[PDB]
Design a protein around this ligand. Structure first.
Ligand SMILES: [K+]
Ligand SMILES: [K+]
Ligand SMILES: [K+]
Ligand SMILES: [K+]
Ligand SMILES: [K+]
Ligand SMILES: [K+]
Ligand SMILES: [K+]
Ligand SMILES: [K+]
Ligand SMILES: [K+]
Ligand SMILES: [K+]
Ligand SMILES: [K+]
Ligand SMILES: [K+]
Ligand SMILES: [K+]
Ligand SMILES: [K+]
Ligand SMILES: [K+]
Ligand SMILES: [Mg+2]
Ligand SMILES: [Mg+2]
Ligand SMILES: [Mg+2]
Ligand SMILES: [Mg+2]
Ligand SMILES: [Mg+2]
Ligand SMILES: [Mg+2]
Ligand SMILES: [Mg+2]
Ligand SMILES: [Mg+2]
Ligand SMILES: [Mg+2]
Ligand SMILES: [Mg+2]
Ligand SMILES: [Mg+2]
Ligand SMILES: [Mg+2]
Ligand SMILES: [Mg+2]
Ligand SMILES: [Mg+2]
Ligand SMILES: [Mg+2]
Ligand SMILES: [Mg+2]
Ligand SMILES: [Mg+2]
Ligand SMILES: [Mg+2]
Ligand SMILES: [Mg+2]
Ligand SMILES: [Mg+2]
Ligand SMILES: [Mg+2]
Ligand SMILES: [Mg+2]
Ligand SMILES: [Mg+2]
Ligand SMILES: [Mg+2]
Ligand SMILES: [Mg+2]
Ligand SMILES: [Mg+2]
Ligand SMILES: [Mg+2]
Ligand SMILES: [Mg+2]
Ligand SMILES: [Mg+2]
Ligand SMILES: [Mg+2]
Ligand SMILES: [Mg+2]
Ligand SMILES: [Mg+2]
Ligand SMILES: [Mg+2]
Ligand SMILES: [Mg+2]
Ligand SMILES: [Mg+2]
Ligand SMILES: [Mg+2]
Ligand SMILES: [Mg+2]
Ligand SMILES: [Mg+2]
Ligand SMILES: [Mg+2]
Ligand SMILES: [Mg+2]
Ligand SMILES: [Mg+2]
Ligand SMILES: [Mg+2]
Lengths: 386, 131, 62
RNA sequence: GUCUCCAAGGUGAACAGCCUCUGGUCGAUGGAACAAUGUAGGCAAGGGAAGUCGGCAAAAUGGAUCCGUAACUUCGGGAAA
RNA sequence: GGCUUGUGGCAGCCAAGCGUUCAUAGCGACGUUGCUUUUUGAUCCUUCGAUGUCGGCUCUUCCUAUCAUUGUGAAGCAGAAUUCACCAAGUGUUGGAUUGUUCACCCACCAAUAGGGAACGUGAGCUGGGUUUAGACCGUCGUGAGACAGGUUAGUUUUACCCUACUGAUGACAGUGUCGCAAUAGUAAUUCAACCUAGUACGAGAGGAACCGUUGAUUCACACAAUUGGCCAUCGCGCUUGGUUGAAAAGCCAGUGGCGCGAAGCUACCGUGUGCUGGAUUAUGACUGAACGCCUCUAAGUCAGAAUCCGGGCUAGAAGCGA
RNA sequence: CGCGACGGGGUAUUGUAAGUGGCAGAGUGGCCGCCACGAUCCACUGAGAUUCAGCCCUUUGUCGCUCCGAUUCGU
């Protein structure tokens, strides 16, 4: 018979299975649609989640209660040091989808990227790309490399660059094995894309060349892991009465008599967290460029001389010294987790998307407690230099 | 103009709040909250500025055993202002009004939340301090 | 220049984007920097009696 | 499950509970982890029985001193109201 | 459960009449044709070397005979509201008093508080209020023992470690590693309010909309912890009762002695952030246009067109595949 | 070649350590102001304690270890 009362089902069937992701680095499932009329430009970037803080800004939203008022909103700091282009790959459009045609690598590869090709770098002989790097040293070999590039210009329909992070520059991560990913190149003709990619071989691409301030981006990564978990926490089913024999953190009925099988739509206990997620429409509030005032936490209203990093350092992460992005809201994953930034696939036209951000205050008090000092000097002056 | 942002709900059904007006009622017993569409097993709840249907459990006999609308003016549950500050009052209070939001009484005792004053100009007129 | 409030209990400076504001029945407004000051206030502890508060240090000429 | 004898110090009204001396004893297979579910013990913003057949369970009350104590009553009580 | 469908429920045909006029806007008397198995009966085919027998709670899925929401046709449709009908099951359908109830009834909210199936879904899921053992009371009945689809009160709810299903976890997938492609499967967003339009269209007046746009909110989903809130055996610091080490100092015992604060970690609509776009079409309204010298959305050929469908996006990634 | 173990600094929690001194202290007991007892109070002292165990930086400084092995895999 019909259920006595109606409520929506617990959880979403669009995120199944709730298994551990088969990857640690966020995979870009779809790149932005390519517009040939625009200049060649990268579409994605890698970063590392440093921590969270809150900012205060004066809202400019005509017709809103907050118009010309101040609002406090949380933000996430993503440290985004420049990436290094080390190769190019071309794909051909076939009736069976895109097929990888060829992969051309740069002559010189850093030790950090070479570590990505080994499970035990120190114990190995470190032979990776040694024979490949030699054909850059001969005229006949150079001709072959150029011939491969011309082959991509003729047949390739999609061009992606091989780029890796400079993970050594963030000592807090305690990792020397860099992260490598394919970043699609949009804009221009195929020949321009290949020339654009080959020109960056062994060069650095700053985050500013991909993203900018006040634009909406998508963040891709793996959520925080939580291990084996019961239905109440995993799926949000309500608890059973106190007097339930054999426990109350369960689903009471897991199925009718017929079909004589448990269905895949019933909540079950299992892995929770460490799932791949793609979150949309994250506005960029600030882009910090090293060596510029934008890298500091100064604002047009607050002239206190201080850095982005809170006193005592970002908990579990360290001190941010490279380029970084200040992103509204929260980011997937734990501290130190590598996150993938992608350009929006939609046309951003809403007022919120076009709103011009103007920060008034950036909090830099300690996040390891009830921090009340924005700078170490302020704390020292408070206690008479302590 | 703009509409009021969401606030933490601290007053579910069966909550008994003080009567902050001079109508003669001493407390208001919440039986429902206007605008609640609801969820299975979820008790309707109200915040400062919400209109609720209430009964007077203690007060003048002329006001008892009757269902009348009321507006919450204070609550003890902290709620977040847009500027990041969490506010709360020392008690829970409300005032009896008519379906159009006009006060049945003529005076208000104690302060009232700014959120309630913006939505109900009649209540704000009789208020002493708007915080 | 930023507008910063002061904690009514401890006297600590409160930076924008945080703070706890309590409205007493007599319309008095109390700003607390954290739950520590909030709890001690509602526990009826006097700041003059707590060594670390600004009120104690001012009365003792610290 | 099975009769009975001897019975220290402190706290306290007290062979109550809690700690100690004489005497006895560390006998309950061990090791490493700290998931779900469980059993046992807890706590919790705001609301306060809306839960449920039903306040089930839990919480609240609790010692002592002083003050004060209604209906009703078989005049004794009720009463630690 | 099965056959049957009298009964129950739902639907059609004829047109006497109702509807101020007017059979058919909306109704359909007298008759007559059906559908349904969410009623109750009829039967006794399966089960008496046993298929756990009420209801609620919990949870998923399915149906449409559509309560609300999207798009339309009709009206005795001026507006507003309402009624009839079409495509339509994508989304939603609530908080309570009394009763063991199913059913019912009332209060209140809501866009709406539609109806049903899944062994009258669901007891090795719970609960045990009822019914339906043994104790006991009343009324009626009986000479009596005792009886009562009469009332009342107390009355043990057992087992999973097997196979499968389902949920996750390794492995396998022909050296090893990195970066990728991708069949296929899953899938998600939802509804409301305010302001403006506007006291405007419409109307004698009373009354009284809508699209665009703007700002919020509900239900839901996925994350997240800067801030607020919660949790303490940080046994972190302080305070404190009883005992104890000859005192002091410093500790220990009372399975966490107790109390205040408590970082970290975890965590809440009790906190914060985010939640998407093309194509093809249904109903329906049209274009051109014959059959049928006219006419005609239809016959050939076309157009617009939705909470629809498919894709895209999001989740997974095959004894599939590439560099 | 960095890592590891100490230590230091940063950060945070509690709330001002022990010792010394006091012409602070309700008072009380002796002696001829001195002496003894006294919870508590004040100064040194936002002090002391704790702070990754899944916090941040790090030789000013100290110390250690940098690899004995084992199991397989071929177009
Ligand atoms: K049911
Ligand atoms: K959640
Ligand atoms: K529950
Ligand atoms: K409702
Ligand atoms: K456990
Ligand atoms: K109750
Ligand atoms: K029938
Ligand atoms: K049988
Ligand atoms: K079972
Ligand atoms: K009993
Ligand atoms: K290979
Ligand atoms: K799909
Ligand atoms: K916390
Ligand atoms: K001391
Ligand atoms: K001190
Ligand atoms: Mg895809
Ligand atoms: Mg974990
Ligand atoms: Mg039980
Ligand atoms: Mg913190
Ligand atoms: Mg319920
Ligand atoms: Mg005694
Ligand atoms: Mg004893
Ligand atoms: Mg509570
Ligand atoms: Mg409380
Ligand atoms: Mg109460
Ligand atoms: Mg009840
Ligand atoms: Mg109920
Ligand atoms: Mg009890
Ligand atoms: Mg009595
Ligand atoms: Mg008939
Ligand atoms: Mg049998
Ligand atoms: Mg059986
Ligand atoms: Mg069975
Ligand atoms: Mg239909
Ligand atoms: Mg009309
Ligand atoms: Mg439906
Ligand atoms: Mg009842
Ligand atoms: Mg049936
Ligand atoms: Mg059944
Ligand atoms: Mg069963
Ligand atoms: Mg059972
Ligand atoms: Mg049952
Ligand atoms: Mg019973
Ligand atoms: Mg009996
Ligand atoms: Mg007789
Ligand atoms: Mg009974
Ligand atoms: Mg599909
Ligand atoms: Mg007019
Ligand atoms: Mg001592
Ligand atoms: Mg002992
Ligand atoms: Mg105890
Ligand atoms: Mg939330
Ligand atoms: Mg024509
Ligand atoms: Mg047509
Ligand atoms: Mg068309
Ligand atoms: Mg240290
Ligand atoms: Mg570590």
């Amino acid at each position: 018979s019909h259920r006595k009362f109606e409520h929506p089902r617990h959880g979403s069937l669009g995120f199944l299975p709730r298994k551990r992701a088969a990857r640690h680095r966020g995979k870009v499932k779809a790149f932005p649609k390519d517009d040939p009329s625009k200049p060649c430009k990268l579409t994605a970037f890698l970063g590392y989640k440093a921590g969270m803080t809150h900012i205060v800004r004066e809202v400019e939203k005509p017709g809103s209660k907050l118009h010309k008022k101040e609002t406090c909103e949380a933000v996430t700091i993503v440290e985004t040091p420049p990436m290094v282009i080390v190769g190019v790959v071309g794909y051909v459009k076939t009736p069976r989808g895109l097929r990888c045609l060829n992969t051309v690598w740069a002559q010189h590869l850093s030790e950090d990227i070479k570590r990505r090709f080994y499970k035990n770098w120190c114990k190995s002989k470190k032979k990776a790309f040694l024979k490949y790097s030699k054909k850059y040293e001969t005229d006949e070999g150079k001709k072959d490399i150029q011939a491969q590039l011309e082959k991509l210009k003729k047949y390739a329909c999609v061009i992606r660059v091989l780029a890796h992070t400079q993970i050594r520059k963030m000592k807090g991560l305690k990792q020397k094995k860099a992260h490598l990913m394919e970043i699609q190149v949009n804009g221009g003709s195929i020949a321009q894309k290949v020339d654009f990619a080959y020109g960056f071989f062994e060069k650095q691409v700053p985050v500013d060349a991909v993203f900018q301030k006040d634009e909406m981006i998508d963040i891709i990564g793996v959520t925080k892991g939580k291990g084996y978990e019961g239905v109440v926490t995993r799926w949000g089913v309500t608890r059973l009465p106190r007097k339930t024999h054999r426990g109350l953190r369960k689903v009471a009925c897991i199925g009718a008599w017929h079909p004589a099988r448990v269905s895949f739509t019933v909540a079950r206990a299992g892995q929770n967290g460490y799932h791949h997620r793609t979150e949309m429409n994250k506005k960029v509030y600030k882009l910090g460029k090293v060596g510029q005032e934008s890298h500091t936490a100064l604002t047009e209203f607050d002239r206190t001389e201080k850095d982005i990093t809170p006193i005592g350092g970002f908990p579990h992460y360290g001190v941010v010294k490279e380029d970084y992005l200040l992103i509204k809201g929260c980011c997937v994953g734990t501290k130190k987790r590598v996150v993938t930034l992608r350009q929006s696939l939609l046309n951003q036209t809403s007022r919120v998307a076009l709103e011009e951000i103007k920060l008034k205050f950036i909090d830099t008090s300690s996040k390891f407690g009830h921090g009340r000092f924005q700078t170490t000097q302020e704390k020292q002056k408070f206690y008479g230099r302590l | 103009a703009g509409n009021k942002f969401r606030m933490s709900l601290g007053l579910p059904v069966a909550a008994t709040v003080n009567c902050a007006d001079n109508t003669g009622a001493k407390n208001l017993y919440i039986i429902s909250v206007k605008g609640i569409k609801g969820r299975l097993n979820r008790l309707p709840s109200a915040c400062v500025g919400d209109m609720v249907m209430a009964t007077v459990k203690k007060g003048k006999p002329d006001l008892r055993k009757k269902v009348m609308p009321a507006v919450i003016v204070r609550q003890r549950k902290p709620w977040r202002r847009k500027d990041g500050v969490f506010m709360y009052f020392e008690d829970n209070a409300g005032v009896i009004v008519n379906p159009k939001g006009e006060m049945k009484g003529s005076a208000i005792t104690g302060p009232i939340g700014k959120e309630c004053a913006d939505l109900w100009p009649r209540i704000a007129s009789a208020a002493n301090a708007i915080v | 220049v930023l507008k910063t409030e002061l904690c009514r209990f401890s006297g600590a400076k409160i930076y924008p984007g945080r703070g706890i504001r309590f409205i007493r029945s007599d319309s008095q407004v109390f700003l607390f920097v954290n739950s520590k000051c909030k709890h001690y206030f509602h526990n009826k502890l006097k700041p003059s009696k707590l060594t670390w508060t600004a009120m104690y240090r001012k009365q003792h000429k610290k």
